[PDB]
């Protein structure tokens, strides 16, 4: 008991001489005080956390880095109370507005081989562990009283400054006031609080013994570790495997991992120039459309068009707030021959945001929750894709209701369900790349139709013999994505006066014959031109002239886009008749 504090006052002094003395670098070059400088540079910025490394602590004093592996609970306290006595003799005198010394959350990382969740045997209870995984959930941050103060009820006696223990363990209020039995309540005005989250860590997929569903563990983040990771991340946790103390079997407890170290597994001025010169080089168009479909070959138009959807037009707000689209839609009609699934996978992989779908659905649903017994709202994919791109196959398989809703979503660009207890709106901002295998109106919700075709001549068969081994055997995306990420966000293209009179005279003469086309034959179905398709043409020309960072588009691409469209509309002309 009396030797307890006498040991501590000798550990809190050897943990302080570590931060105050540990250096790096050799004698030839020159040295660097590693942790004083980070304490100062993190305090003056207003961060209050250092990241101690366990190899250093081991190499300085070998005993401490062992205690820290065996009794991490009652020694992290001494470490974090020496970090506060060193951050005092380094930054003082604090200037004017701060003179109270804050508290330093000492995190800690390491370079040691990770265990796994399946290797957490109960002999590892309250020992630093180090496990990898994947975040699967994330609670909302909450408060957690640290330094609490109570008060009696009848005689109004106070007993303040009481300190909670960290982790998930409560506190046992007295019952002996020194007044009725339990006269003590909490004074909400005087209780310091800190944030805390609660994640959920699933084990990596390539370490399940493959007969079942992966197991998971529960974490407990703290002041500065909160809101640091997002469901879907890979991490590497260093925590204190411990047990809940809120006091199937008789003596069973719950268990969590109190996290005290976290990691994550994975623009420049000079990088800007490899975008600049590439946008400026004369044949900037085809260089991309060549390296966006290596496996599948043939008919680069179906790859020419896809180049634009990755960039897109620009979002305009007229004075009326009547905004305009900023995305495009594509249909690849034709037999399912698996030649298109490859392309879907590619465009999804090489996209800033993208989802390939065949669960809850695409658009929002209203489902009767078991718990609430009432209806709740399920925003599907097209609400999660913000500016991204959504790929779809088998356009006749999707649920009737779902297909209706996707029709309306591509129409208005938002989903608004007014049902049992749900009246909300979700902005759908994504790009539809559909593959077909159909009303003249859901078909007209798009603007570009590509159907598949072939021949059988023996020179054509030589082309086929070529294409045989191009698959038998089986500009980079890793920079293509980081190029688009800067191209989309720096160009403001509009049309020049000449493109206007080009398009007017193209579109008027496209209309002018549809009359004599439909007035005689009228084969119960056809497809004429509409102003929506014209606006599609304009937003295609924008995406073309954005490849070049060219703030003003001209006749350089309008005619070739119009011919691309002469392909894309004649396709549906042949299909619909």
């Amino acid at each position: 008991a009396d030797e307890g504090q006498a040991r501590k006052s000798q550990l809190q002094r050897r943990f302080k001489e570590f931060l105050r003395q540990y250096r790096v670098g050799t004698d030839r070059t020159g040295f660097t005080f590693k942790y004083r400088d980070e304490l100062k540079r993190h305090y003056n910025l207003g961060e209050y956390w250092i990241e101690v490394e366990m190899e250093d602590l081991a190499s300085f004093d070998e005993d401490l880095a062992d205690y820290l592996y065996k009794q991490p609970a009652e020694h992290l306290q001494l470490l974090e109370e020496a970090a506060k006595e060193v951050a005092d003799e380094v930054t003082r005198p604090r200037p004017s507005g701060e003179e109270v010394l804050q508290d330093i959350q000492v995190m800690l990382k390491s370079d040691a081989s990770p265990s796994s969740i399946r290797s957490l045997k109960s002999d590892m209870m309250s020992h630093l562990v180090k496990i990898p995984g994947i975040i699967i959930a994330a609670s909302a941050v909450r408060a957690k009283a640290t330094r609490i103060s109570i008060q009696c009820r009848s005689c109004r006696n106070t007993l303040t400054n009481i300190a909670m223990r960290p982790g998930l363990e409560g506190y046992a209020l007295p019952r002996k006031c020194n007044c009725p039995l339990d006269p003590y309540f909490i004074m909400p005005d005087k209780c310091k609080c800190v944030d805390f989250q609660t994640l959920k860590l699933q084990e990596l997929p390539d370490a399940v013994p493959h007969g079942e569903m992966p197991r998971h563990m529960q974490l407990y983040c703290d002041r500065y570790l909160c809101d640091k990771v997002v469901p879907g991340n890979r991490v590497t946790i260093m925590g204190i495997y411990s047990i809940k103390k809120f006091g199937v079997g008789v003596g069973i407890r719950s268990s969590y991992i109190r996290v005290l170290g976290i990691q994550v597994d994975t623009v420049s001025p000079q990088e800007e120039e490899e975008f600049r010169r590439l946008a400026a080089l004369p044949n900037v168009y085809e260089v991309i459309s060549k390296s966006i479909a290596p496996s599948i070959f043939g008919g680069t138009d179906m790859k020419k068009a896809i180049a634009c959807l990755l960039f897109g037009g620009s979002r305009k707000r007229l004075p009326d707030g009547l905004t305009r689209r900023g995305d495009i839609n594509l249909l690849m009609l034709g037999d399912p021959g698996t030649a298109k699934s490859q392309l879907l996978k590619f465009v999804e992989k090489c996209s800033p945001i993208g989802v390939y779908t065949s669960a809850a659905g695409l658009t929002a649903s209203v489902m009767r929750d078991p718990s609430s017994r009432n209806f709740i709202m399920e925003g599907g994919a097209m609400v999660l894709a913000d500016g991204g791109v959504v790929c779809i196959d088998e356009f006749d398989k999707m649920r009737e209701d779902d297909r209706v809703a996707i029709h309306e979503a591509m129409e208005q660009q938002t989903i608004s369900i007014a049902k049992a207890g749900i009246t909300t709106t979700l902005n759908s901002r994504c790009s539809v790349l559909a593959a077909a295998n159909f009303m003249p109106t859901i078909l007209s919700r798009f603007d570009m139709i590509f159907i598949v075709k072939d021949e059988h001549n023996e020179e054509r068969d030589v082309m086929l013999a070529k294409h045989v081994i191009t698959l038998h055997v089986s500009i980079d995306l890793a920079k293509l994505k980081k190029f688009i990420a800067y191209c989309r966000v720096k160009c403001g293209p509009r049309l020049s006066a000449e493109a206007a009179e080009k398009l007017k005279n193209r579109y008027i003469i496209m209309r002018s014959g549809a009359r004599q086309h439909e007035r005689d034959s009228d084969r119960r179905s056809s497809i004429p031109i509409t102003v929506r398709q014209l606006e599609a043409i304009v937003r295609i020309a924008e995406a073309l002239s954005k490849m070049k960072l060219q703030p003003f588009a001209t006749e350089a691409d309008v005619e070739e886009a119009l011919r691309l469209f002469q392909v894309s509309t004649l396709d549906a002309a042949l299909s619909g008749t």
Partner: protein, 335 residues
């Protein structure tokens, strides 16, 4: 343990000796025996260097009039194989379940995740439901399932080879129409199968005795008054100690066939051998690397690969085309 297998594989004629080791009772069908043997050991699941993810699983789809030991072909492959499972089509994915003991609403494994490396034996394929149909196709060309259920949003793995048997409509397969009519199955699903064997019936006199005598005798020695040891240990061994290689001498030996046959089929009412058939042929290329320990592509088992990939295509054809294409190719391919 291997020292026998060395010379047993070096017999150079292990094909015939292994074909008549599976299907131990059921007489005949040395045709479909071949295909199913090809399927059992499998092939080679090579990873294409262009990020295209070609699969290394052989999926089979029997079909034929009732009473032709299809179900027995399923049940025996249940036994001989390893880590196999089974199901009927009249549970395919993980579902929320209230545990018997723990009384918590957990998630339980379905029927396509319990074959994550082995085989999945589907029965009564026709009787599947629309949700079941829209869920089975996803796992063929992706081999990976997502579950955004009431439990939690996960994405697990499923690498299984599918062995199923459908039924003929009208109580009898009639080969006037194409096979895509008597099967009663959605069209982009049949493409997800490598082999399409069509079972039928026969009234030939000389085989009536052959089949009768066999059944009668199998009812004489079963009642209370390559064997099954070489090939089980052999599917265990040959699964492991081979890694077939791929040269480029066969790369042009096939196209000379495709350029002809594409025209030959498109000429009439049919769709010729397409890329999803070349993939099956090239998968069955290595299907014999597991039997011979050969593991080197040669112009010999290419005569076998092309032969099989057309065997599973001439049958699924029209009345006079199933014989016109025969008169051309069955005499052309120099069987």
């Amino acid at each position: 343990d291997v020292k026998m297998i060395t010379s047993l594989s070096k017999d150079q004629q292990i094909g015939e000796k292994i074909f008549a080791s599976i299907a131990p009772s059921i007489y005949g069908h040395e045709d479909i025996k071949r295909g199913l043997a090809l399927a059992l050991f499998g092939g080679e699941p090579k990873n294409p260097g262009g990020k295209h993810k070609v699969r290394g699983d052989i999926n089979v789809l029997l079909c034929g009039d009732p009473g032709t030991a299809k179900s027995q072909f399923l049940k025996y492959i249940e036994k001989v194989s390893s880590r196999a499972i089974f199901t009927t089509g009249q549970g395919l994915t993980a579902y929320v379940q209230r545990h018997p003991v723990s009384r918590e609403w957990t998630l339980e494994a379905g029927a396509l995740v319990l074959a994550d490396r082995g085989v999945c034996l589907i029965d009564e394929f026709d009787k599947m439901n629309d949700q079941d149909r829209t869920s089975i196709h996803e796992a063929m060309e992706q081999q990976s399932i997502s579950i955004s259920k009431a439990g939690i949003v996960t994405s697990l793995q499923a690498r299984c080879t599918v062995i199923a048997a459908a039924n003929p409509i009208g109580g009898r397969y009639d080969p006037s129409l194409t096979f895509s009519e008597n099967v009663d199955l959605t069209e982009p699903i049949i493409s997800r199968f490598d082999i399409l064997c069509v079972v039928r019936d026969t009234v030939d006199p000389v085989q009536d005795e052959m089949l009768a005598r066999f059944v009668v005798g199998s009812h004489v020695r079963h009642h209370p008054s390559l064997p099954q040891e070489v090939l089980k240990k052999y599917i265990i061994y040959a699964k492991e100690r081979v890694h077939p290689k791929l040269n480029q001498m066969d790369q042009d030996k096939v196209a000379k066939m495709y350029s002809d046959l594409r025209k030959e089929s498109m000429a009439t009412g049919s769709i010729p051998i397409t890329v999803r058939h070349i993939e099956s042929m090239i998968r069955m290329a290595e299907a014999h690397a597991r039997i011979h320990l050969r593991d080197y592509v040669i112009e010999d088992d290419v005569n076998m690969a092309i032969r099989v990939m057309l065997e599973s295509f001439i049958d699924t054809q029209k009345f006079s085309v199933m014989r016109s294409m025969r008169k051309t190719f069955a005499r052309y391919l120099s069987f």
